[PDB]
């Protein structure tokens, strides 16, 4: 597993992600959005784990309306997953306290935890 990005910094993270995906076709990939708090999307923060199936990618919590210009970044993220033909979007709910510890765990463990907790989600809510 690769880890790119840094916590709480939306535009740098988006530019880096755009760099890293490339001409990879995503039709068999699974997209996991890691967040705390089910109800309130307005003050939400978002981290992302992408399981391509041939390799995995982690981004910390740099996304969402929680940070300035963050909403537009999450929206373009999901739009971009959608363009490469990613379809299967999932939402994972962690304790705020977890979020820092979760991404400091080793790749395999973090990934199994994420797939265990993740809820199938409409890509449209992040647009």
């Amino acid at each position: 597993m690769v880890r790119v990005g840094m916590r709480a910094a939306p535009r740098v993270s988006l530019e880096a992600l755009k760099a890293a995906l490339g001409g990879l076709k995503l039709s068999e990939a699974k997209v996991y959005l890691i967040t705390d708090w089910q109800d309130k999307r307005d003050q939400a923060r978002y981290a992302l784990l992408l399981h391509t199936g041939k390799k995995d990618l982690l981004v910390p919590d740099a996304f969402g309306p929680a940070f300035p210009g963050g909403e537009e970044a999450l929206s373009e993220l999901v739009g971009l997953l959608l363009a490469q033909g990613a379809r299967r979007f999932y939402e994972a709910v962690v304790s705020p306290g977890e979020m820092t510890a979760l991404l400091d765990l080793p790749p395999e463990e973090l990934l199994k935890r994420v797939m265990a907790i993740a809820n199938p989600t409409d890509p449209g809510i992040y647009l």
Partner: protein, 196 residues
Amino acid sequence: MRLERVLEEARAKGYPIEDNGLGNLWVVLPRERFKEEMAHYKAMGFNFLADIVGLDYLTYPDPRPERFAVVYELVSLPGWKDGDGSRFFVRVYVPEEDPRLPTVTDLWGSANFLEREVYDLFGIVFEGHPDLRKILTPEDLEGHPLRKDYPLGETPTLFREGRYIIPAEFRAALTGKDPGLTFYKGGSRKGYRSLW
């Protein structure tokens, strides 16, 4: 009467016999003799195959011979041709690094779905099966959910102002290998049984 003929047979061939005074009885056959012996079991007059119950003993306080163990429930229906009402468990231990076991599909078509379930939830593959397809867990689910090393997968329960509960950090109840909240546990909390 058909049960006696099973136990008497197991004692001679060196098969260990488990008994709880609740009225439940087991017979553990080795891996080798399993397929054939059990073929003989249906042949022995065993109409009905009730269960295939998979067990993951990873987190069980005492050790057992191998990590996973499967229990079949064989019976002869009491209202049929000549039914005893003889019902009993046959247990077969299975290696962690070798989740193999012959199906009794040929024998009972009961063996069909149940062995598939035990494949889905635990990694155990059943030989000679018509179709081992994943049964229960979502198509794109990765792994085998009910085996102990696999997360129950809880999500925090949610309240008002930054307030959360993490169930696994909330739990008052202790498991078998749990210490408890004092220096140790003795007595009833190391296990208890009333005496009728």
